[PDB]
From Swiss-Prot, chain A:
Source organism: Escherichia coli (strain K12)
Alphabetized Pfam families for the sequence: Ribosomal_L32p
InterPro entries per UniProt: Ribosomal_bL32, Ribosomal_bL32_bact, Ribosomal_zn-bd
Native organism taxonomy: Bacteria, Pseudomonadati, Pseudomonadota, Gammaproteobacteria, Enterobacterales
Region of interest: Disordered: 1-37
Subunit structure: Part of the 50S ribosomal subunit. Contacts L17.
Gene Ontology molecular function terms on file: structural constituent of ribosome
Family, per entry: Belongs to the bacterial ribosomal protein bL32 family.
Protein name per Swiss-Prot or TrEMBL: Large ribosomal subunit protein bL32
Keyword list, A-Z: Ribonucleoprotein, Ribosomal protein
Single biological process term from Gene Ontology: response to radiation
GO CC aspect terms: cytoplasm; cytosol; cytosolic large ribosomal subunit
Curated annotation (Swiss-Prot), chain B:
One Gene Ontology MF term: structural constituent of ribosome
Domain of life per record: Bacteria
Keywords assigned: Ribonucleoprotein, Ribosomal protein, RNA-binding, rRNA-binding
Organism: Escherichia coli (strain K12)
Protein name per Swiss-Prot or TrEMBL: Large ribosomal subunit protein bL19
Gene, per the UniProt record: rplS
Swiss-Prot record, chain C:
Encoding gene, per UniProt annotation: rplN
GO terms under cellular component: cytoplasm; cytosol; cytosolic large ribosomal subunit
Family statement drawn from the similarity comment of this UniProt entry: Belongs to the universal ribosomal protein uL14 family.
Naturally occurring in which organism (per UniProt): Escherichia coli (strain K12)
Protein name: Large ribosomal subunit protein uL14
Effect of residue 114 to A: Reduced RsfS binding
Effect of residue 98 to A: Reduced RsfS binding
Domain of life: Bacteria
Gene Ontology terms: biological process: cytoplasmic translation
Subunit structure: Part of the 50S ribosomal subunit. Forms a cluster with proteins L3 and L19. Forms two bridges to the 30S subunit in the 70S ribosome, contacting the 16S rRNA. In pre-50S ribosomal subunits interacts with RsfS, which may inhibit association with the 30S subunit.
Effect of residue 97 to A: Reduced RsfS binding
Record SUPFAM superfamilies: Ribosomal protein L14
UniProtKB/Swiss-Prot annotation, chain D:
Quaternary structure and partners: Part of the 50S ribosomal subunit. Contacts protein L32.
Gene: rplQ
GO biological process per UniProt: cytoplasmic translation; ribosomal large subunit assembly
A Gene Ontology term for the protein's cellular component: cytoplasm
Taxonomy, superkingdom: Bacteria
UniProt function note: Requires L15 for assembly into the 50S subunit.
SUPFAM superfamilies per record: Prokaryotic ribosomal protein L17 (SSF64263)
Protein's UniProt name: Large ribosomal subunit protein bL17
Keyword annotations from UniProtKB, A to Z: Ribonucleoprotein, Ribosomal protein
Record-stated family: Belongs to the bacterial ribosomal protein bL17 family.
PROSITE patterns (UniProt xref): RIBOSOMAL_L17
Gene3D superfamilies in UniProt: Ribosomal protein L17
Species this chain originates from: Escherichia coli (strain K12)
Length: 56, 114, 123, 118, 186
RNA sequence: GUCCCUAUCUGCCGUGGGCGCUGGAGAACUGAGGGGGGCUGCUCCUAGUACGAGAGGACCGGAGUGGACGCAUCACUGGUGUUCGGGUUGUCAUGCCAAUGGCACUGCCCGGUAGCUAAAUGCGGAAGAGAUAAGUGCUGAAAGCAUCUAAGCACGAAACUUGCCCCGAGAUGAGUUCUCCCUGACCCUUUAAGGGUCCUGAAGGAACGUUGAAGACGACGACGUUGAUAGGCCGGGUGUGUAAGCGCAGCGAUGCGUUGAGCUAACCGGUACUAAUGAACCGUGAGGCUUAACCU
RNA sequence: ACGAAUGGCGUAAUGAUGGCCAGGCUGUCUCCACCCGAGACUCAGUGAAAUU
RNA sequence: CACAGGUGGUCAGGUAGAGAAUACCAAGGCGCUUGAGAGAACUCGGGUGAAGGAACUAGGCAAAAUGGUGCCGUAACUUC
RNA sequence: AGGACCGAACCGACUAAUGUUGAAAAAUUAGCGGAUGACUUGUGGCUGGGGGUGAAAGGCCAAUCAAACCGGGAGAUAGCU
């Protein structure tokens, strides 16, 4: 089954009204390195909760 | 949980004899006709044992009048007055369901001689 | 747990050996007949010199089933085969003079005291 | 419905799952830290830690169970000679799962899983 | 009559001395504490609000804590209301326990049934004008909803261990909340 | 015309996001309204009674048990249970023996935990109330009577509204109750429900994490160290059925002992060992006008 | 009523040929239940179509 | 189309097997150019199934079942 | 010996399901038929459109066939849209 009428740009926008991405609420800051990171994720320099968990 | 266990613990029989599949047992069951209550004996081969505490059960198979009859007893039911092991069987399975295809010569069970 | 087309052995000496359930009596759209239930059958196999003859249509009461019967304590009795006892169409009384194999306490009703009396065992 | 059921299917059949976790347990034992997806790490806990517990008691039969599992004498030897005694006092929780972002190729949630005493 | 809030502990059996096995659902009905009494004057209807169980002191939100503190009761794991018949009255803070059922022969038990998720028509409805009428039986969410089962026989009220044994099955999984009311059909 | 349909629209079944509901928030409700449900057989007492020359046989009411259907559940009986145990064929591998693993539809099978589940087992249909239908009536004139009707009054069915169950305040007519939180300063101008800066950021929420008998995803629930939320661990249970190794018997297959052994998923009871991080984020700073009443 | 090389009547054997019956077997069904996979669903990347 | 298609000849290891079937392997070559999760309905391909056993249906369609070797034994009919 | 039997390669295509904006303008999967023959197959050759070829189906003759394809008559004709 297929449309009989071209849906409008209005309806396209209404359907896409729920497509918006949600930005990360806020980043965590490691107490030792001071790097920002996703909460519960290790930092880019391999820190987590003030611990060098992975070397390099 | 603990509550269910204590409730079951206040109902399990304490004098349950130990039997294994392949044993021949005689189960005395309470039978009530009218108002007269009496014991009927069911003797056969234990072919399955379900150990679930209060919900324990065991299946006994006998061939009465050329008909194979399986009766599953609820081990802790008061209707089961007594269980007596008449013969120790020597099998290797927990469930002897293959005995349903066995007749006469094929259904003998080796004695557990110890 | 007998339904239409089920083949049943006969537990009596009325002459029939195998019957097929042709209708489960006792209620509209009733599906299964257990131990103690009445069914119309047709005779499929009978002895040549018997009181009933192949193709006879008459009622019967189911006395043994593989599906089994449950007892109030949860226990269950199971048989190797499905067995019935022939009844007359109108009197609904047994036609044979003996019952072979055990029957159950579930027939202990005023309608079926004959079968309990004639039963070698009433489990 | 999957009420009370456990164990992730991981879009694999049973034999593939078993083989993959055998391999992954071997990698975790020999390297002591591996980078895998978060669900695989979580299921890997349930495969590796029982191996270590088994390795706690050193016997021929235990080594043959740890070999029937993991199918590797390198890994069995390391288990029973290093990880068993290293974790002899620790009651469970031999592994540590560290979430580490997302895989570039497919945006999978990645996680480091490592032995706790590494 | 009012009901009580309990917890579904699980199912078990009771063997009667004449050899009947009664499937029982064990309901742990611990003390229900009246947290609020509602009347016509202030509320337009008569009811009691009860709580039960215990709650994490650090997980009682401050509105909830104030509501329980007015009653002078300890925070429970929820609030439930029971409508009152005119002869019935209770006081805030008063505790109600399971021997309220000591003489009740049948009860109604309502709980949230197990959730079957998105269920098809076969499971959900036992399947085999220019429009569809409302209420058309279709696939959708099954279970996970309030369900009452009526006229369950009370097998045992054990006050000391806070137990109600009702004959038969009651809605919901083990550990779920149950509202047990004396049977309204009777 | 039939059947399909990668289903845009209508319809429908479910389930969310937004904003609203006039300070915000957490709950508990009310109930406008809507939906579901409403079936039936048999047996037994009344009662072999009334009736009928007999034969035959009630109305009414009462009591249990079935069917069909529905709702729930998994204690039982079972099914499933490619995540548990075992047997076994062919082959390959782990150096070899032994022991194991892979592959052959889960290789083929035998059992079976949890969960799910029916065939399993609990429960339901109602009672009651209100107003009625056909119909039965009371009184009563028109029409000196008669008349159930004109005034009035009483009954009257699974029909209607209730009563039972569920949804339900977006019921915009946006309701009620309880509780909780916020009690700074200043500037500007088209001076108003105005804008702005600084300080402040509550209750709570959200997010993240561990997850769930919740679940397509959202959602909903539990928990986040002051912790049993999940995994592991310990003990048990359960299942399977006497592991391996060793010893003995045997020529050997194999048997016996150690040994109801070893192993054992989702189960139970525990246990902080691992992971649930301090924070940060959103949400503000007493809540318009008019009029009535009351405290003063 | 067809009908005798537009062949009539038979015929062992043969047939992925038409019709029927029996045994066995069974989820074809009563009446579905559970499970294992591949999609469906969510996330990331790429990204059509009929129709209008 | 980097397309489940088509395309002649040659070579022919081991174990089991009658076999160039089939299973598992060698030599050798590959994991098929989207992944990651989840574990709804439903679709597709499978496994199992109580009691019944074709009651399904247009129709046993589909499925299930039979299946090997040796020895015995083997009907009507027959053009032998 | 055999247009013998069972059965792979090989040739086919009976059933069902899937697919049916396909993986595919005819397949896949599971079954199925033939499988020393009137078999099958490579290479090359020949037969040409009112013609060929056809164990014959109006089949096939380059995914096209109750008369191929291409160019021309040709802007055929169309009281029809
Ligand atoms: Mg159109
Ligand atoms: Mg979208
Ligand atoms: Mg779990
Ligand atoms: Mg995938
Ligand atoms: Mg395999
Ligand atoms: Mg669920
Ligand atoms: Mg049609
Ligand atoms: Mg569709
Ligand atoms: Mg209705
Ligand atoms: Mg259970
Ligand atoms: Mg079972
Ligand atoms: Mg199995
Ligand atoms: Mg196994
Ligand atoms: Mg060996
Ligand atoms: Mg291999
Ligand atoms: Mg292979
Ligand atoms: Mg009434
Ligand atoms: Mg008058
Ligand atoms: Mg009504
Ligand atoms: Mg834990
Ligand atoms: Mg055990
Ligand atoms: Mg072994
Ligand atoms: Mg001819
Ligand atoms: Mg059907
Ligand atoms: Mg996408
Ligand atoms: Mg386009
Ligand atoms: Mg490719
Ligand atoms: Mg190709
Ligand atoms: Mg070829
Ligand atoms: Mg091959
Ligand atoms: Mg699936
Ligand atoms: Mg399927
Ligand atoms: Mg099958
Ligand atoms: Mg079956
Ligand atoms: Mg069977
Ligand atoms: Mg049969
Ligand atoms: Mg038929
Ligand atoms: Mg037939
Ligand atoms: Mg039919
Ligand atoms: Mg077929
Ligand atoms: Mg098959
Ligand atoms: Mg031939
Ligand atoms: Mg051809
Ligand atoms: Mg299909
Ligand atoms: Mg094929
Ligand atoms: Mg042939
Ligand atoms: Mg052949
Ligand atoms: Mg033609
Ligand atoms: Mg062509
Ligand atoms: Mg022409
Ligand atoms: Mg011209
Ligand atoms: Mg032209």
């Amino acid at each position: 089954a297929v449309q009989q009428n071209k849906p409008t740009r209005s309806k396209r926008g209404m359907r896409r009204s729920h497509d918006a991405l949600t930005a990360v609420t806020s980043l965590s800051v490691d107490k030792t390195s001071g790097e920002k990171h996703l909460r519960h994720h290790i930092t880019a320099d391999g820190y987590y909760r003030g611990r060098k968990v992975i070397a390099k | 949980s603990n509550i269910i266990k204590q409730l079951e613990q206040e109902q399990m029989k304490q004098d349950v004899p130990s039997f294994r599949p392949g044993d021949t047992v005689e189960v005395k069951v309470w039978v009530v006709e009218g108002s007269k209550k009496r014991l009927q004996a069911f003797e056969g081969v234990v072919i399955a044992i379900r150990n679930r505490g209060l919900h324990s059960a065991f299946t006994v198979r006998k061939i009465s009048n050329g008909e194979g009859v399986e009766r599953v007893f609820q081990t802790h039911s008061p209707v089961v007055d007594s269980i007596s092991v008449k013969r120790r069987g020597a099998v290797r399975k927990a469930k002897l369901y293959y005995l349903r295809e066995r007749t006469g010569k094929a259904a003998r069970i080796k004695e557990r001689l110890n | 747990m007998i339904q239409e087309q089920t083949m049943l052995n006969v537990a009596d000496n009325s002459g029939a050996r195998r019957v097929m359930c042709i209708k489960v009596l006792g209620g509209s759209h009733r599906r299964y007949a257990g131990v103690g239930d009445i069914i119309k059958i047709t005779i499929k196999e009978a002895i040549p010199r018997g009181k009933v003859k192949k193709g006879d249509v008459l009622k019967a009461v189911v006395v043994r089933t593989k599906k089994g019967v449950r007892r109030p304590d949860g226990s269950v009795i199971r048989f190797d085969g499905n067995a019935c006892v022939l009844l007359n169409n109108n009197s609904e009384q047994p036609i044979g003079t003996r019952i072979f194999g055990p029957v159950t306490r579930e027939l202990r009703s005023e309608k079926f005291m004959k079968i309990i009396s004639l039963a070698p065992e009433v489990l | 419905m999957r009420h009370r059921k456990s164990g992730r299917q991981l879009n694999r059949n049973s034999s593939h799952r078993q083989a993959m976790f055998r391999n992954m347990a071997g990698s975790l034992v020999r390297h002591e830290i591996i980078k895998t997806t978060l669900p695989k790490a979580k299921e890997l806990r349930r495969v590796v830690e029982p191996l270590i517990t088994l390795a706690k008691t050193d016997s021929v039969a235990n080594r043959r169970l740890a070999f029937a599992r993991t199918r590797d004498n390198e890994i069995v030897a390391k288990l029973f000679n290093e990880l068993g005694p290293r974790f002899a006092s620790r009651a469970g929780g031999y592994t540590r799962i560290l979430k580490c972002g997302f895989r570039a190729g497919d945006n999978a949630p990645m996680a480091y899983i490592e032995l706790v005493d590494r | 009559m009012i009901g009580l809030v309990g917890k579904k502990v699980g199912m078990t059996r009771i063997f009667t001395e004449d050899g009947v096995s009664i499937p029982v659902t064990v309901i742990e009905v611990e003390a229900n504490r009246v947290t609020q009494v509602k009347d016509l004057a202030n509320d337009g209807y008569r009811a009691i609000q009860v709580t039960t169980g215990a709650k994490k002191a650090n997980r009682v939100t401050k509105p909830e804590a104030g509501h329980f503190a007015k009653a002078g009761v300890e925070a429970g794991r929820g609030l439930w209301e029971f409508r009152l018949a005119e002869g019935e009255e209770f006081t805030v803070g008063q505790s109600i326990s399971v021997e309220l059922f000591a003489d009740v022969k049948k009860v109604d038990v309502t709980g949230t049934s197990k959730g079957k998720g998105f269920a098809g028509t076969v499971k959900r409805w036992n399947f085999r004008p220019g429009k569809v009428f409302k209420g058309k039986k279709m696939a959708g969410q099954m279970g996970n909803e309030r369900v009452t089962v009526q006229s369950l026989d009370v097998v045992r009220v054990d006050a000391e261990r806070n137990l109600l044994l009702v004959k038969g099955a009651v809605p919901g999984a083990t550990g779920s909340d149950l509202i047990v009311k004396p049977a309204v059909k009777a």
